[PDB]
Design a protein around this ligand. Structure first.
Ligand SMILES: Cc1cc(N2CCOCC2)cc2[nH]c(-c3c(NC[C@@H](O)c4cccc(Cl)c4)cc[nH]c3=O)nc12
Length: 110
């Protein structure tokens, strides 16, 4: 059941990275580059950064013991965005749209 669950998780990650969702997913493809984005305090506020490329690296590396560990990293990526940004920020709206996809797919895991 454990490897079966992670294969389903790997499929969620594929979907989140697919062109269908790119209009809102793209800000989450890569780690936040605080210098390049001029968010120079980002790592003072966000102590555990996360992004979809890091989830992929960890999934490929078999670092997730279960689907719950996968889900916690994905929710950490959304919560970092809700924590750092003002609630009316463009990127918060994009995070919510992507989280709507994640939560639905994750809940439908057989
Ligand atoms: C530009 C900018 C300004 C500020 N200010 C903080 C102080 O309060 C006023 C606002 C916070 C930001 N947070 C992020 C951010 C990301 N950005 C990608 C960027 O390519 C991007 C992509 C889509 C829309 C936008 Cl608007 C920017 C990606 C993931 N998580 C993030 O949190 N960008 C911010």
């Amino acid at each position: 059941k454990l490897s079966e669950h992670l294969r389903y998780c790997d499929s969620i990650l594929r979907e989140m990275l697919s062109k269908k969702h790119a209009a809102y997913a793209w800000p989450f493809y890569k780690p936040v580059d605080a210098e390049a984005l001029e968010l120079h305090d980002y790592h003072d506020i966000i102590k555990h950064p996360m992004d979809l490329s890091t989830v992929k690296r960890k999934m490929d590396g078999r670092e997730y013991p279960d689907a719950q560990g996968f889900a916690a990293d994905v929710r950490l990526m959304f919560s970092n965005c809700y924590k750092y940004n003002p609630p009316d920020h463009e990127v918060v709206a994009m995070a919510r749209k992507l989280q709507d996809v994640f939560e639905m797919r994750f809940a439908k895991m057989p």
